[PDB]
C-alpha cells in the first residue's frame with residue numbers, strides 16, 4: 001500500500017487502554033498504554049507518530065475516535081488526512097510474566113513483533129526510503 | 133557514524149524532565165516528557181526506542197544515568213551495549229505558546245526538527261536502509 005497510510009486502534013487489556021498504530025504497508029507497529037481512551041491521548045499520540053514517520057493518512061476501525069476537535073487539530077497541524085491487534089496481544093501474553101507492568105510487556109511485544117522475520121522494522125525503512 | 137549509535141540525555145524545562153534521544157549519524161530525535169528522572173523511566177524509554185529502531189549502542193553525557201540495574205536489564209534484554217538539546221529547546225520556545233502542555237510543545241518541536249531540511253527524518257531512514 002501507500003507508504004503514508006497508518007491504522008490506529010485502541011484495544012483493552014487488564015482494564016487499561018493500549019493504543020496500537022500499524023503501518024499498513026509494512027506491518028510495523030508502534031503501541032503505547034494510555035490511562036483513558038480520550039481524544040486528548042489520541043491527539044498527543046498522533047503528534048508523536050507524525051514527528052517520527054511521514055504520516056499522510058490515518059485509518060481506524062472506530063471512526064468515532066477521530067471526531068473530537070482536539071484530534072482534528074492534531075491532524076490539521078501535522079497535515080494528516082483520513083486483525084493485527086490479536087497478534088500483538090498474543091505476544092503480550094507470552095512475555096507478560098517477564099514484566100510487572102503491562103506497559104513494559106507491550107513494548108517488549110512491539111520489539112518482538114517489529115524484529116521477527118524481512119522484518120516489519122526492516123520493511124518500513126525500505127518502503128519509506130524507496131519513496132524518498 | 134555507525135547506524136546503531138544513539139545519544140540519550142535528560143534535560144529540564146518548566147520543572148519537568150525531557151528525555152531526548154538522538155540518532156548520532158542522522159540528527160534524528162525522539163523525545164518524551166517524563167515525570168521524574170528515574171532509572172525506571174530510562175529503562176522503559178530504552179525498550180521503546182529499541183523496538184522502533186535498531187539500537188546497538190547508547191551514549192550519554194551523564195554516565196550515572198546507566199548505572200541502575202533496571203536500566204542494565206533493559207539494555208540486556210534488547211541487546212544494547214554502551215549541543216543538540218539547545219536546538220530542540222530553541223524550537224520548543226518558539227512553539228510553546230501554541231500549546232498548553234509542555235509535552236505537546238515537545239512533540240511539535242520533534243516534528244519540526246525531524247522534518248526540516250535532506251531532513252533528519254529522511255537521513256535516518258536512508259542510513260538504516262542502506263545498512264540493510
Ligand SMILES: Cc1nc2c(cc(C)n2Cc2cnn(C)c2)c(-c2ccc(Cl)cc2)c1[C@H](OC(C)(C)C)C(=O)O
Pocket residue numbers: 098099100101102104105171172173175176179201202203205206209210
Ligand atoms: C517495575 C520494574 N522493576 C525492575 C526491572 C528490573 C529490575 C532490577 N527492577 C527492580 C526490581 C524488581 N524486583 N527486584 C528484586 C528488584 C523492570 C524491567 C526492566 C527491563 C525489562 Cl526488559 C523487564 C523488566 C521493571 C519493569 O518496569 C520498568 C521497565 C522499570 C518501567 C517491569 O514492568 O517489570
Ligand SMILES: Cc1nc2c(cc(C)n2Cc2cnn(C)c2)c(-c2ccc(Cl)cc2)c1[C@H](OC(C)(C)C)C(=O)O
Pocket residue numbers: 039040041043044047069070071073074077078230231232233234236237
Ligand atoms: C490540552 C489541549 N486541548 C485542546 C487542544 C485542541 C483543542 C480544540 N483543545 C480543547 C480546547 C482548548 N481551548 N478550548 C476553547 C477548547 C490541544 C492541541 C491539539 C493539537 C495541537 Cl498541534 C496543539 C494543541 C491541547 C494540547 O494538549 C493535547 C495534545 C490534547 C494532550 C495542548 O497541550 O495544548
